[PDB]
Amino acid sequence: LDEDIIAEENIVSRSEFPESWLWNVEDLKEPPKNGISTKLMNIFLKDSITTWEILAVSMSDKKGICVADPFEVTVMQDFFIDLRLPYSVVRNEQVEIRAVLYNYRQNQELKVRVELLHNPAFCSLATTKRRHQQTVTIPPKSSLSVPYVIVPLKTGLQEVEVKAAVYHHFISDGVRKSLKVVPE
């Protein structure tokens, strides 16, 4: 807790991954200039690491409707985790989720201590007391896959969470995804 690394105490995961958002309504009441009202908008990007596509339509009784072109915005990171959960698991069947660790650093391998957090509602090598970590090496410009086998223990909506930190840097990610548990 004094090593060249970030602490699980201090990792705040990403969790907010909408599939669509900013379903908002703004009004060009600004002072027209050269005929073109201009609004500046303050938006907060959501946690997902992807490319957002923003679509605007304008309606004016003078000039009508107007499907603005699409406009792309890419949120990314040099290192992060992809927690690939499937749509739904069945309570009490054993599966294997994969944590994919991406390292898009130019030129140096990364050493990570990645860790599946304990969840009472799941049967994992992770206990209230003992944690479940490996320590792994990702080449640069590529991906390391990290198996975690688990067993869902309660129906309804359950939550898997992984955290990883790189050594010597102070980079860290953590994802909190949720999957449907269904009874047999």
Binding site: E16, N24, D27, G35, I36, W52, V57, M59, V67, D82
Partner: protein, 641 residues
């Protein structure tokens, strides 16, 4: 002998402003005119309020503005009766009307939802001018077996034409293609629909894209169909993995897979190469005169797997045409009537097989070797031929002429243009030669007015009366003055955004001549205006320069649009679009709704004076009784090829 003419749209519309042109030909002093519409048949006096006078100031040209209400009045077209009374004289015509209010567009936040994920949707509501209007709308949500599972009834009054809405997808429900349908409470028959898929999915973390080096396959192409596979994460970054590719042939809606064409290639540095060989494609069917395979299509499904085994993605390019020639040839943007002796402007349309406009492609006609002309960025080529003053149908046949293609590989097509059939076969004509490029609002277009008649009554003609159709309504109607001895007069046409996407121009003159005969000579021309929003809308970045933002980070968004306009926003993880990219809203989709709603059915002209008028969305009724074939069909001529 004074003559009064009435000119209206071919088909009127409810609850919207229409316009009709009043004219006094050869009359003296002020002429007061009253105009009245009545239900048909009988009398309801639906609109009489309007009165006007044709002053010698304004060369006796009138403005008609009226709005027909929607009173308690099927399967049989309803009509109306426009009665225009100049002084005491009383002219009238029987026209067709439509219950079609306007348009409706629906927007869904995503293209695809999972059971239990709510679907956001907007109904944009507008009149035939694409202006926001406010009516009452009904909205159904049909499940994939067609059964309305929810409806609401909403008014767009004081909502600036935008109806927000949602629907919570139940937890258990049929997967499949759902539909959202909406109509104006006035007119149930004109329904509007957008779809959305309901499925079970996790989002994919990359997109896959398949691509034939050619937009088609040439049957004699020994190499077979070559295809490049491409994968890249949503965060822009190249993919490593392996990918399974496989082909098939489509006939109509019928689909045969070529099981043997299955290939497993490595996807390296985001890309991969792969091919269907002419042999598999033929064996795969059964080596019939390859010629047989002509007309059918190909398709490729690829499926990539990351080397991590975590995430899969399918994707398929469909209906790649099997063709003997690369290009296609179309005369549907060229009129079907010329004037003997006068130069005929040919608008040849040259599409790639798929359907796309093909740029820079040479074309010319049967006869003359020296005549050539390329295809501007719109897949259009302007060729003009001087025609002979012979009362003989003029058959034209055009043919591609690309170097590096064999004369068998070149593509042709034939059309037949008939001469303009005058009054009493007098040989009096009018031509509008218009320089043809990509017109843009602001740019100024010249309309050459060319007079073709024996100088006998040449001094008589004093003026041209012109009109502009647009989105099937009158956008302007004016006069172009002329002086004797002139055959050419040029019209300065300012071109504003009100012309988009395309406008029609019909000019006509009238006179007495030969043997005391009341005449009408005319001409109609179609011109595309380079489509694009009528005002503007753009959403660029806030921070002029910057590095990629970071998950959860603040970012400033910039919106440049029309003053006072309303914008409605949505941002969508592009990962969705890798599961479904269909049924999105486009402005191009709207222009397409607006053109198919044109009342004008011809590129240009008329068989006779009275056709020019019915071809563009117009009617001409004069005192002297020279009216136009009355219009009683809602849609254009059912395509006869």
């Amino acid at each position: 002998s004074p003559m009064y003419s009435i000119i209206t749209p071919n088909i009127l519309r409810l609850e919207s402003e229409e316009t009709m042109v009043l004219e006094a030909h050869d009359a003296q002093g002020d002429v007061p005119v009253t105009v009245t519409v009545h239900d048909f048949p009988g009398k309801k006096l639906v609109l009489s309020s309007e009165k006007t006078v044709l002053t010698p100031a304004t060369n006796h040209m009138g403005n008609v503005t009226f709005t027909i209400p929607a009173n308690r009045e099927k399967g049989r077209n309803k009509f109306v009766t426009v009665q225009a009374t100049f002084g005491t004289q009383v002219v009238e015509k029987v026209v067709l009307v439509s219950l079609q209010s306007g348009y409706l567009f629906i927007q869904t936040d995503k293209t695809i939802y999972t059971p239990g994920s709510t679907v956001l949707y907007r109904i944009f509501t507008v009149n035939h001018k694409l202006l926001p209007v406010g009516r009452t709308v009904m909205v159904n949500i049909e499940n994939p077996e067609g059964i309305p599972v929810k409806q609401d009834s909403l008014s767009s009054q004081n909502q600036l034409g935008v109806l927000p809405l949602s629907w919570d997808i139940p937890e258990l429900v049929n997967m499949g293609q759902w539909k959202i349908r909406a109509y104006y409470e006035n007119s149930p028959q004109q329904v509007f629909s957008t779809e959305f898929e309901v499925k079970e999915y996790v989002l994919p973390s990359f997109e896959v894209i398949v691509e034939p080096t050619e937009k088609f396959y040439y049957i004699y192409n020994e190499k077979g169909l070559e295809v490049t596979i491409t994968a890249r994460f949503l965060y822009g970054k190249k993919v490593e993995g392996t990918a399974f590719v496989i082909f098939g042939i489509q006939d109509g809606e019928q689909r045969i897979s070529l099981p043997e064409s299955l290939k497993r290639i490595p996807i390296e540095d985001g890309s991969g190469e792969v091919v269907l060989s002419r042999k598999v494609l033929l064996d795969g069917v059964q080596n019939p005169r390859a010629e047989d395979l002509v007309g059918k299509s190909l398709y490729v499904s690829a499926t990539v797997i990351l080397h991590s085994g975590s995430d899969m993605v399918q994707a398929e390019r469909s209906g790649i045409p099997i063709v003997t020639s690369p290009y296609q040839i179309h005369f549907t943007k060229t009129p079907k009537y010329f004037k003997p002796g006068m130069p005929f402007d040919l608008m040849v349309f040259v599409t790639n097989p798929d359907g796309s406009p093909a740029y820079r492609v040479p074309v010319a006609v049967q006869g003359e070797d020296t005549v050539q002309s390329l295809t501007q960025g719109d897949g259009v080529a302007k060729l003009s031929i001087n025609t002979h003053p012979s009362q003989k149908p003029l058959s034209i046949t055009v043919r591609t002429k690309k170097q590096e293609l064999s004369e068998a590989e070149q593509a042709t097509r034939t059309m037949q243009a008939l001469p303009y059939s005058t009054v009493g076969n007098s040989n009096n004509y009018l031509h509008l030669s218009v320089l043809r490029t990509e017109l843009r609002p602001g740019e100024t277009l010249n309309v050459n007015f060319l007079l073709r008649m024996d100088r006998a009554h040449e001094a008589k003609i004093r003026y041209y009366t012109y009109l502009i159709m647009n989105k099937g309504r009158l956008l302007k109607a004016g006069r172009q003055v002329r002086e004797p001895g002139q055959d050419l007069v040029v019209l300065p046409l300012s071109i504003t955004t009100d012309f988009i996407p395309s406008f029609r121009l019909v000019a006509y003159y009238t006179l007495i001549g030969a043997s005391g005969q009341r005449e009408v000579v005319a001409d109609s021309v179609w011109v595309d205006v380079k489509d694009s929003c009528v005002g503007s809308l753009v959403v660029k970045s806030g921070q002029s320069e910057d590095r990629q933002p970071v998950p959860g980070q603040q970012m400033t968004l910039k919106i440049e649009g029309d003053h006072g306009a309303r914008v409605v926003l949505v941002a969508v993880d592009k990962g969705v679009f890798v599961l479904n990219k269909k049924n999105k809203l486009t402005q191009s989709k709207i222009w397409d709704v607006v053109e198919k709603a044109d009342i004008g059915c011809t590129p240009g002209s008329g068989k006779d004076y009275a056709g020019v008028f019915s071809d563009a969305g117009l009617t001409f009724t004069s005192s002297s009784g020279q009216q136009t074939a009355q219009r009683a069909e809602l849609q254009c001529p059912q395509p006869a090829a």
